[PDB]
Enzyme design. Structure first.
Site, PDB file in Angstrom:
ATOM      1  N   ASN A 194       0.826  -1.195   0.000  1.00  0.00           N
ATOM      2  CA  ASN A 194       0.000   0.000   0.000  1.00  0.00           C
ATOM      3  C   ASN A 194       0.862   1.248   0.000  1.00  0.00           C
ATOM      4  OD1 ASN A 194       1.019  -0.216   2.534  1.00  0.00           O
ATOM      5  ND2 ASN A 194      -0.816   0.524   3.551  1.00  0.00           N
ATOM      6  N   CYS A 195       0.242   2.348  -0.389  1.00  0.00           N
ATOM      7  CA  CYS A 195       0.827   3.675  -0.379  1.00  0.00           C
ATOM      8  C   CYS A 195      -0.105   4.608   0.385  1.00  0.00           C
ATOM      9  CB  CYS A 195       1.064   4.157  -1.806  1.00  0.00           C
ATOM     10  SG  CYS A 195       1.590   5.855  -1.934  1.00  0.00           S
ATOM     11  N   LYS A 196       0.190   5.903   0.336  1.00  0.00           N
ATOM     12  CA  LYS A 196      -0.721   6.884   0.911  1.00  0.00           C
ATOM     13  C   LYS A 196      -2.077   6.832   0.234  1.00  0.00           C
ATOM     14  CE  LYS A 196      -1.095  11.784   1.932  1.00  0.00           C
ATOM     15  NZ  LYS A 196      -2.380  12.002   1.228  1.00  0.00           N
ATOM     16  N   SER A 197      -2.087   6.909  -1.089  1.00  0.00           N
ATOM     17  CA  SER A 197      -3.321   6.898  -1.848  1.00  0.00           C
ATOM     18  C   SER A 197      -3.525   5.619  -2.633  1.00  0.00           C
ATOM     19  CB  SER A 197      -3.354   8.082  -2.816  1.00  0.00           C
ATOM     20  OG  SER A 197      -2.384   7.914  -3.828  1.00  0.00           O
ATOM     21  N   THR A 232       2.298   2.708  -5.174  1.00  0.00           N
ATOM     22  CA  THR A 232       1.740   1.380  -5.359  1.00  0.00           C
ATOM     23  C   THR A 232       1.832   0.952  -6.812  1.00  0.00           C
ATOM     24  OG1 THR A 232       0.258   1.466  -3.467  1.00  0.00           O
ATOM     25  CG2 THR A 232      -0.382   0.101  -5.307  1.00  0.00           C
TER      26      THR A 232
END
Lengths: 249, 249
Positions: free
Chosen positions: A147-150, A155
């Site tokens: 996962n990433c921030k958004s 990602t």
């Protein structure tokens, strides 16, 4: 992004409390909610692949406290590169699968990176540790998740990296060494993957325009992540970074 | 009391020699001796709850050599308070019992006490480690056993402490924090337990008079164990210490 990390780690801890069995709700084939019982086991990592983490270096100490626990969970209590794997990898190998060659290579490389702290710099390729962790997890029949921030920029880049390596390996090859630029054939694979993966459509669906925020080209040249070399093509590099700079929002 | 301890520890070691199976004689329902085979597993502790051990401090170093081995046997090789339990506790939790909440809390508290050496002082309550060890043993389906020199004074006091905590917990509560005085309700529970447990009759049966030698009230006030505060009643405190001072023998 700091508090974001402790929130995620706390959530995983609350679901993997020892002896605690988890109840999930699932819509069966009849459209009726049904309860199932899961015994989860999660190894949670955090690496950081930005310029903020690799060039000037932020949160390396904070993340490594989490990563140490996760490695002990995944490989055992002995992390010397020449020792024998333990943990989940050891349990998988104890079944004597016909998969042993790839698993042993991946475990050795991960220990090497951890020993020299090679993930603190980008020796030509910044996803060196994250990419191998995901590939190893799939080999030993776990489920890899990232996962990433958004969930669309970093990602998406890691998605492309994994696909490139899987395709390259599928041709009965071996794995590449850590921190090494792709060769000519690998570059052709990577160029095809970056455009023919579904990332661009995910970008457009999630935002309205295709692009990637990982491609920046900062003004002091020592602050760039060196994707110009990994993607040996100016036009393709400019194509991956699409309308990404017009989405200040 | 030193040589007493090595004699006890030596006895336990001789019965738990690795690979050695123990034969016991038991009178069956027909009144005939019959031999049974046991595979014992004993974790042996020693704490010390006197003024001689808590105020001025005797044998703390001697006992801790035994306690370290026993904790490794009971909780595993990692005793950090935030780690996951191992050893016997880990094996019990691996079955996913509906008991997990209490077990996790007790294991965490024990590691806390061990880390700060809180059992070397009496922060208001001197049985902090012994009481939790016995309660934890019962939770994970072991058998708890405790002893004193004669088995009626300090043994009786620990009996009362355990009963008070079990009763307090049974009301769906949580466990109290280490080294904390009981509240008003806890004090009422403790007062009822100290008189309505069977300790007084054990005292009379074993000696001829009811009492407890743990209640002393030494002349320099800094040498007292602070049961005046735990038992918030002068008359009840004077009732627990009965004819105990007239049994010089």
């Amino acid at each position: 992004e700091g508090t974001m990390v402790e929130d995620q780690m706390r959530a995983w801890q609350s679901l993997t409390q020892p002896g605690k069995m988890i109840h999930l709700k699932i819509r069966n084939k009849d459209g009726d909610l049904q309860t199932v019982k899961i015994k989860p086991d999660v190894a949670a990592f955090n690496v950081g692949v930005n310029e903020l983490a690799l060039k000037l270096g932020f949160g390396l100490k904070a993340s490594d406290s989490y990563n140490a626990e996760a490695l002990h969970q995944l490989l055992g209590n002995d992390l010397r590169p020449e020792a024998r794997p333990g943990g989940w990898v050891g349990e998988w190998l104890a079944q004597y699968p016909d998969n042993y060659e790839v698993v042993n290579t991946l475990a050795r490389q991960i220990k090497d990176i951890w020993k020299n702290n090679q993930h603190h710099k980008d020796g030509g390729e910044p996803y060196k540790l994250a990419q191998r962790l995901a590939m190893l997890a799939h080999e030993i029949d776990a489920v890899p998740a990232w996962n990433c921030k958004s969930g669309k920029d970093r990602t998406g880049m890691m998605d492309s990296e994994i696909k490139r390596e899987i395709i390259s390996l599928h041709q009965t090859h071996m794995l590449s060494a850590p921190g090494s630029l792709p060769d000519s054939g690998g570059q052709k694979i990577f160029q095809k993957v970056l455009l023919n993966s579904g990332n661009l459509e995910i970008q457009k669906q999630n935002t309205g325009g295709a692009g990637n925020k990982v491609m920046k080209n900062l003004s002091p040249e020592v602050l760039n992540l060196s994707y110009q070399k990994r993607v040996g093509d100016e036009n393709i590099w400019q194509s991956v970074k699409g309308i990404s700079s017009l989405i200040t929002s």
